[PDB]
Amino acid sequence: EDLVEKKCLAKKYTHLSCDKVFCQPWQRCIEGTCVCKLPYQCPKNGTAVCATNRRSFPTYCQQKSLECLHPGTKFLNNGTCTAEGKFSVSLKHGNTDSEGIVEVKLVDQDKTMFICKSSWSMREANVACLDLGFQQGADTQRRFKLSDLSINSTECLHVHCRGLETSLAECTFTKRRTMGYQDFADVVCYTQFQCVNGKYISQMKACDGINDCGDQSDELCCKACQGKGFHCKSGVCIPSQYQCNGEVDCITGEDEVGCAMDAERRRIKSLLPKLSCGVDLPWQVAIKDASGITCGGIYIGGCWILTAAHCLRASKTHRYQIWTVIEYVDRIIFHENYNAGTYQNDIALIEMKKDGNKKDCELPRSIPACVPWSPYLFQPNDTCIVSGQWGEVKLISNCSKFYGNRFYEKEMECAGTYSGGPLVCMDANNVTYVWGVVSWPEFPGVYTKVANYFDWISYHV
Ligand SMILES: *[C@@H]1O[C@H](CO)[C@@H](O)[C@H](O)[C@H]1NC(C)=O
Ligand SMILES: *[C@@H]1O[C@H](CO)[C@@H](O)[C@H](O)[C@H]1NC(C)=O
Ligand SMILES: *[C@@H]1O[C@H](CO)[C@@H](O)[C@H](O)[C@H]1NC(C)=O
Ligand SMILES: *[C@H]1O[C@H](CO)[C@@H](O)[C@H](O)[C@H]1NC(C)=O
Ligand SMILES: *[C@H]1O[C@H](CO)[C@@H](O)[C@H](O)[C@H]1NC(C)=O
Ligand SMILES: *[C@H]1O[C@H](CO)[C@@H](O)[C@H](O)[C@H]1NC(C)=O
Ligand SMILES: [Ca+2]
Ligand SMILES: [Ca+2]
């Protein structure tokens, strides 16, 4: 069984990696990695929450964003802080400090109860160990087996966590009617497939939909899921029940297409301002010079047009006009590491003069295409619309077979048929993405892969 890919594992993508996953609403994507946004950037609408330092926060986002920025400050309770209320988890009846039967003291309830093992998974186990100090979550191979004793009472606490929470306080608890025997949730916290955090687990746990690692190493590099997990085209697995649950989990977005405090974070997403991108060829532009040689531009937003370098620098005059309506081009920025012969980094930004002398560059009625932030959005055998009429090309795999060392897989994309023009692709929700630009049967078109230039794009845009 060869579910896991090896070539990713060098780059070690955790849940903090944009390219493979969505940043939590108290975070912002910057250079492929989830960073903290300041509390005053969170959506205003939310109910108050309590942090372990007895401090109260208007929104749940704002708390989690302070915890993000300022370690130590954990979560405690929904609603304002009580004076007496204080949360506690503990491992009792155990031969060592990093193991036992889990005991929870629910901030409000003065009574102390145990957890039931019939619903106890790695999602809860990891979260438990994480607030217990052990930063690598629960052990997956090891156990703590009991032999009766303290199995008198009928008490129990069913728990459920997403799995990435930094405290059991954040999870949802519900008292259940316990059967037997035996039903008490044990755990072994990890004290020394490898995870990015440093945790070894067996290969059978890798790529099954379940976060065994704690930071999602075992799930982000998957050609196909093991058990019930659902394979995102992006190469990631998600729990089957993550299908049609009102949250776009896969960066590709396919789990929510074709459908007819965990609940609080989902709520916080649906209020974030979504990008207005890629609504015959509205994005299509044509960069004509006064000489008479044309390039196939693609409108991405506002003042900006994206094209290939070589065609622009074919002009002697260095003065253009953008046709689609006629705008003028103020300045042009080529990528600094453009290599003429190899065509690596064959990409350039055009900045329009705007004109009007009163407002902004944007055209009254023009739709910008979407710029891919991840190189895992579109994959082989995906269909894409080439233009320069328009031809439906397909993305081809293993392009070393055709060109070898003239094709640099990180910086270039090959589209097999079935200047500087666009290679536009659409996802399941009808979002038009500018996937590639035209760069240079057994000769498939080669395209500079734009997703690998989102940081670069961003720097100027
Ligand atoms: C929440 O949003 C509504 C509009 O949907 C708005 O009327 C209200 O003022 C917002 N809440 C706060 C606390 O500002
Ligand atoms: C959570 O907190 C709010 C106050 O912030 C409270 O009114 C509400 O009843 C609590 N419970 C739920 C399930 O929202
Ligand atoms: C894409 O556009 C079509 C237009 O026929 C529309 O019916 C459909 O709802 C859109 N796709 C999705 C996933 O909604
Ligand atoms: C211990 O107490 C429980 C609940 O009060 C009751 O079932 C019984 O008296 C004892 N349990 C067993 C298994 O003997
Ligand atoms: C890639 O797409 C083609 C479409 O014809 C189809 O064979 C299959 O979905 C994929 N190819 C393979 C070999 O799995
Ligand atoms: C990639 O090349 C290998 C040989 O090096 C070949 O087996 C395979 O068919 C190629 N893949 C594709 C999708 O053409
Ligand atoms: Ca797993
Ligand atoms: Ca989902």
UniProtKB/Swiss-Prot annotation:
Chain ranges of the Peptidase S1 domain: 280-461
Catalysed reaction, written as an equation: Inactivates complement subcomponents C3b, iC3b and C4b by proteolytic cleavage
UniProt GO MF annotations: metal ion binding; serine-type endopeptidase activity
Catalytic residues (positions): H310 (charge relay system), D346 (charge relay system), S419 (charge relay system)
GO BP, sorted A to Z: complement activation, classical pathway; innate immune response; proteolysis
Domain SRCR: 89-187
Residues that coordinate or bind Ca(2+) 1: K205, D208, I210, D212, D218, E219
UniProt binding sites for Ca(2+) 2: Y242, N245, E247, D249, D255, E256
E.C. numbers: 3.4.21.45
Effect of G94R: In AHUS3 and ARMD13; the mutant is both expressed and secreted at lower levels than wild-type protein; mediates C3 degradation to a lesser extent than that of controls
Sugar attachment sites: N45, N78, N152, N381, N398, N430
Localization in the cell: Secreted, Extracellular space; Secreted
Segments forming domain LDL-receptor class A: 188-223, 224-260
Superkingdom of the organism of origin: Eukaryota
Top-level EC class: hydrolase
UniProt keyword Transport present: no
Domain Kazal-like span(s) in chain numbering: 30-83
One GO location term (cellular component): extracellular region
CDD domains xref list: LDLa, Tryp_SPc
Disulphide bridges: C8-C221, C18-C29, C23-C34, C36-C68, C42-C61, C50-C81, C116-C156, C129-C189, C161-C171, C195-C213, C207-C222, C225-C237, C232-C250, C244-C259, C277-C370, C295-C311, C303-C361, C384-C425, C399-C414
Tissue expression as described in the entry: Expressed in the liver by hepatocytes. Also present in other cells such as monocytes, fibroblasts or keratinocytes.
Alphabetical keyword list: Age-related macular degeneration, Calcium, Cleavage on pair of basic residues, Complement pathway, Disease variant, Disulfide bond, Glycoprotein, Hemolytic uremic syndrome, Host-virus interaction, Hydrolase, Immunity, Innate immunity, Metal-binding, Protease, Repeat, Secreted, Serine protease, Signal
Function noted in UniProt: Trypsin-like serine protease that plays an essential role in regulating the immune response by controlling all complement pathways. Inhibits these pathways by cleaving three peptide bonds in the alpha-chain of C3b and two bonds in the alpha-chain of C4b thereby inactivating these proteins. Essential cofactors for these reactions include factor H and C4BP in the fluid phase and membrane cofactor protein/CD46 and CR1 on cell surfaces.
Family: Belongs to the peptidase S1 family.
Quaternary state and interactors: Heterodimer of a light and heavy chains; disulfide-linked. The fully processed and mature protein circulates as a zymogen, and is allosterically activated by substrate-induced remodeling of the active site. Interacts with C3b. Interacts with complement factor H. (Microbial infection) Interacts with Staphylococcus aureus clumping factor A/ClfA; this interaction enhances cleavage of C3b into iC3b by CFI.
Protein name in UniProt: Complement factor I
Underlying gene: CFI
